[PDB]
Design a protein around this ligand. Structure first.
Ligand SMILES: [Mg+2]
Ligand SMILES: [Mg+2]
Ligand SMILES: [Mg+2]
Ligand SMILES: [Mg+2]
Ligand SMILES: [Mg+2]
Ligand SMILES: [Mg+2]
Ligand SMILES: [Mg+2]
Ligand SMILES: [Mg+2]
Ligand SMILES: [Mg+2]
Ligand SMILES: [Mg+2]
Ligand SMILES: [Mg+2]
Ligand SMILES: [Mg+2]
Ligand SMILES: [Mg+2]
Ligand SMILES: [Mg+2]
Ligand SMILES: [Mg+2]
Ligand SMILES: [Zn+2]
Lengths: 200, 104, 52, 50, 82, 118, 121
RNA sequence: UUGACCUCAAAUCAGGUAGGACUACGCGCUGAACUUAAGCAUAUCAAUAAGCGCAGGAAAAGAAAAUAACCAUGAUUCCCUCAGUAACGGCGAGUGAAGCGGGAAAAGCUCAAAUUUGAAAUCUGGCAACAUUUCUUUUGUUGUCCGAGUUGUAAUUUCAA
RNA sequence: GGACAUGGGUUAGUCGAUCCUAAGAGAUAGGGAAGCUCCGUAUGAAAGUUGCACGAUUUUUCGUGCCUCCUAUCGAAAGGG
RNA sequence: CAGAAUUCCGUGAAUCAUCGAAUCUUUGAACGCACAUUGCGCCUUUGGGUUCUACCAAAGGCAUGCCUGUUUGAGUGUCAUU
């Protein structure tokens, strides 16, 4: 159907069609609020594959996030420590800008659950994302076995605990030798806990 | 639950035999057990493991056949036996699978 | 108000900003007369309503 | 100061009330050690500090 | 001049009674309680101050509703008449 | 669509009033502070007695939240007398005292005896 | 001491009248207490106070039951009449909501349910 | 002129919902220095203290874009072992995992990508009736109408197919 | 005895506070910030209490109307009143 | 210390136990706006005092963000019919 065509065309971000549409939409986005409601997904095919459905209780929000690194917020570049910690400028936040987009939209919609998010645009100053949210109080959500899980209280603010797709990526959650540091603190605890058995 | 017998990897342990996770799809096929039915009667299914040799296949197919021959399936509706069930369920008791099908 | 300004300057920006052909082929629509004939045929084959 | 808020005045009333001797029958109870108290505040000695 | 005589001019309060926690710690000009952080919608607390936390945490007060919850759980939150 | 001002203002829209599907509170509360809460007790100190027999005024301990309006109604409803003026003070113990002067057609001494604190 | 089972048999208006009598009486006992009184009247203050409470409880019990009656079989009920469990329990998925299954899942349970079986040695 | 659609508002609109607290344990962010190196800057202390966000009865993880190099294994977690080892390190002081093997426990699955197209088969809300209850406090069923939805709600499928 | 014990004692339309604004404080719009929060005070906001009787019997403030550069609040027991 | 013997072969003592119905002041996330003020308002209904507009009293209400839905709208955003 149309979804395959939208998926393939979305891969062509340098084509004349997508370059033009990106320019006009980025201009339009910069004219409205940093966080604003989207009436519909700008990328319906991308939204579906990330869990979105066109039913009551699913909500799309758009947000722009400042690009670039994290300047150390210390008074006059003064760090009061050893030279290894004197850096102020070329530093980087450990969470993705997409994660920040989810965090801020989740605070903005504190009655909703953040499901997922996707990139839509960027200029030199901002990256634009659309965040998919679900109303756990809506009956259409609570009676739906495919999205029911998110009502349970263990899924409260899953974006704040790195439990969305981008949150687990930023946490380095993965299988095998490349992710041995694993959940870091839990792995660290296992290796730094002295185990003293009853030798009898 | 009954488990397959598999050879451990690496040259340090490939001379041994141990319990594996579950029976392969080919092993269940050759023993006449549908994969959807296998779980309902305590036969684990491992979709990941495969049979690279006839020896692994035959060894585990024999384990399933011995399990099925010792298995008493109760009818879904009590007192109305059906196909694949048993009509002498009176002498049913909790027994160890390792007592019947040990890893040799 | 900002929303009115936005939807008006959006039409302007589409007028400048030379449009790629795959987008420019839209805004070339059926004329009024052919459009009426098309809708006359379409209005004959309407889907059945919930009452029907 | 005699210019005082209602909230301040309420606190002064309470402070004056807690600044009283305990009736003796309270200390005469079986199993009570309320015989003497270290909560006897006096205006010149220990200040309320609002 | 810095000692005894200068103590004679101390007659202006920098702190008054906090409406939230009742301590004489409400800084008048900052309109902020130095103890509990009122009027911020969060109670001021620091992990370097475990003793301060102990002075004010749950159980140092009446626990009126929490005791009712505890009794109700004991019987499974039942309602109606016996 | 003629705009003679260079200022767009929000148009006026309907703004319905609340029509709840359920009352949030099942039972309305009875009047708090009606008349048995407003008047706590007569005050019968020596100074209050002088007020009774010299200025035709009664002295009452009243609720902290009573005012001169509600004290007047309470005295009329409880003791069927008509105060002409009411003065109020909050005592250093934190309780409220009311000086209730009666009209020249009523005798405060008789009212005091009828209440029974004499 | 008024008997509460006798109180429930009376109309709300009569109860309201009885309550006013008790409050008037309690005011008299307090006036007499100020101007000297024996120990019987002092014990009568406490008894009269508990009688006022008994009457208030009956009046409120009657009013609340009437409200429950008015809201029987209504979708939306006054808040004080709803459950008073915990906030989390009120927000939890209902057993009905939890037991909802897709058609695919319903078919799977119908055709491949876990059997009862035994191994004979 | 009206109406449709789109986008955007307002209302003490009908019904909901979030915040604060508890932090032993849990998931993240941010982030020292004392200290050790017989000085000291890399290093170490430490991916620690302090600071900030967010949960539950556990959390997180989880049905391989995993191991291996075998006669192969087979989601995750935890224990013993691997192992103070491979490796990192002013190769200084110091630091330091993983696969196999044994054991505890075991459980497996859901979507998006498909034309239902001889029939949106889907869902919410209002109203009414009928049931139901840890419960007049709970939880549904049917009918009807209105909304949602074709810029796609259901149904068969999820690669093991 | 300003100590100790038992009691008593402070009455307002006109005196203050309350109202106003001052230096300043500070929500909101909006933008920063991982965040605690920071900046901001008609500000890049659809930020409206007020001015008209057109309906309305009939001797009067509820309905649309077309309207117009309005405004959070806190902040003085010696300023204003 | 009493008091209560209008009770003690009893729906009845007890600061008894237990607990499924209620009450639950001013506050506090704290919610009309404030608050070093028991300071200053608004709405609905019902009563009081001559008062459909002032005043007094009582009951019930009035915070913010967001979601589904409702209503009333806005746009030289896009259209059909006159
Ligand atoms: Mg998970
Ligand atoms: Mg000095
Ligand atoms: Mg000075
Ligand atoms: Mg006065
Ligand atoms: Mg050193
Ligand atoms: Mg040294
Ligand atoms: Mg040194
Ligand atoms: Mg810490
Ligand atoms: Mg909990
Ligand atoms: Mg979990
Ligand atoms: Mg898979
Ligand atoms: Mg290290
Ligand atoms: Mg003295
Ligand atoms: Mg004056
Ligand atoms: Mg002021
Ligand atoms: Zn405080």
């Amino acid at each position: 159907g149309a979804y395959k065509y939208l998926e393939e065309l979305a891969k062509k971000k340098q084509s004349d069609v997508n370059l033009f549409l990106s320019r006009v939409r980025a201009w339009e986005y910069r004219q409205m609020n940093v966080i604003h409601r989207a009436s519909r997904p700008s990328r319906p095919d991308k939204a579906r594959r990330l869990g979105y459905k066109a039913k009551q209780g699913y909500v799309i929000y758009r947000i722009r996030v400042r690009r670039g690194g994290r300047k150390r917020p210390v008074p006059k570049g003064q760090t009061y420590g050893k030279p290894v910690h004197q850096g102020v400028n070329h530093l980087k936040y450990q969470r993705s800008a997409r994660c920040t987009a989810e965090e801020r939209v989740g605070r903005y919609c504190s009655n909703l659950r953040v499901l997922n998010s996707y990139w839509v645009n960027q200029d030199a100053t901002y990256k634009f994302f659309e965040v998919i949210l679900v109303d756990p109080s809506h009956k259409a959500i609570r009676r739906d076995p495919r999205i029911n899980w998110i009502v349970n209280p263990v899924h409260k603010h899953r974006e704040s605990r790195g439990l969305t797709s981008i949150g687990k990526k930023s946490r380095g959650i993965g299988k095998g030798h490349r992710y041995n540091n694993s959940p870091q603190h839990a792995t660290w605890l296992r290796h730094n806990t002295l185990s003293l058995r009853r030798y009898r | 639950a009954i488990r397959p017998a598999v050879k451990p990897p690496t040259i340090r342990y490939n001379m041994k035999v141990r319990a594996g996770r579950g029976f392969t799809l080919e092993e269940l096929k050759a023993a006449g057990v549908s994969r959807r039915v296998a779980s309902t009667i305590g036969i684990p299914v491992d979709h990941r493991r495969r049979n690279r040799s006839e020896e692994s296949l035959q060894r585990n197919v024999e384990r399933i056949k011995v399990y099925l021959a010792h298995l008493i399936v109760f009818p879904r509706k009590a007192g109305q036996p059906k196909k694949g069930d048993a009509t002498d369920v009176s002498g049913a008791e909790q027994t160890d699978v390792a007592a019947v099908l040990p890893i040799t | 108000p900002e929303y009115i300004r936005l939807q008006r300057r959006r039409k302007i920006l589409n007028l400048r900003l030379k449009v790629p052909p795959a987008i420019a082929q839209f805004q070339k629509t059926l004329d009024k007369n052919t459009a009426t004939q098309v809708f006359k045929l379409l209005n004959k084959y309407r889907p059945e309503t919930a009452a029907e | 100061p005699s210019h005082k808020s209602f909230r301040t005045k309420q606190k002064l009333a309470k402070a004056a009330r807690q600044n009283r001797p305990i009736p003796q029958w309270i200390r005469l109870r079986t199993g009570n050690t309320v015989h003497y108290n270290m909560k006897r505040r006096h205006w010149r000695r220990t200040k309320l500090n609002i | 001049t810095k000692g005894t005589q200068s103590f004679g001019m101390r007659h202006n309060k920098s702190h008054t009674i906090c409406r939230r926690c009742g301590k004489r710690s409400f800084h008048i000009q900052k309109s902020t309680c130095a103890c509990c952080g009122y009027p911020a919608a969060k109670t001021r607390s620091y992990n370097w101050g475990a003793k301060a936390k102990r002075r004010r945490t749950t159980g140092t007060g009446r626990m009126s509703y929490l005791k009712k919850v505890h009794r109700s759980f004991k019987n499974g939150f039942r309602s109606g008449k016996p | 669509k003629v705009r003679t001002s260079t200022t767009f203002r929000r148009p006026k829209t309907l703004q319905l009033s609340r029509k709840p599907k359920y009352a949030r509170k099942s039972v309305a509360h009875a009047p708090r502070l009606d008349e048995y809460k407003i008047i706590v007790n007569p005050i019968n100190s020596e100074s209050a007695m002088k007020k009774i027999e010299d200025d035709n005024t009664l002295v009452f301990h009243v609720h902290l939240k009573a005012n001169k309006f509600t004290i007047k109604e309470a005295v009329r409803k409880l003791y069927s007398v008509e105060p002409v003026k009411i003065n109020t003070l909050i005592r250093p113990n934190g309780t409220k005292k009311a000086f209730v002067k009666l009209s020249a057609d009523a005798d405060a001494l008789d009212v005091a005896n009828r209440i029974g604190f004499l | 001491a008024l008997k509460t089972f006798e109180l429930r048999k009376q109309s709300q208006e009569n109860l309201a009248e009885q309550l006013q009598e008790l409050r008037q009486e309690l005011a008299s006992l307090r006036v007499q207490k100020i101007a000297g009184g024996s120990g019987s009247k002092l014990s009568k203050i406490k008894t009269t106070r508990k009688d006022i409470a008994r009457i208030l409880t009956v009046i409120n019990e009657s009013n609340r039951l009437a409200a429950r009656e008015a809201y029987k079989n209504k979708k939306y009920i006054p808040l004080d009449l709803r459950q008073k469990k915990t906030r989390a329990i009120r927000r939890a998925l209902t057993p009905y909501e939890q037991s909802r299954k897709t058609l695919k899942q319903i078919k799977k349970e119908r055709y491949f349910p876990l059997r009862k079986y035994a191994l004979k040695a």
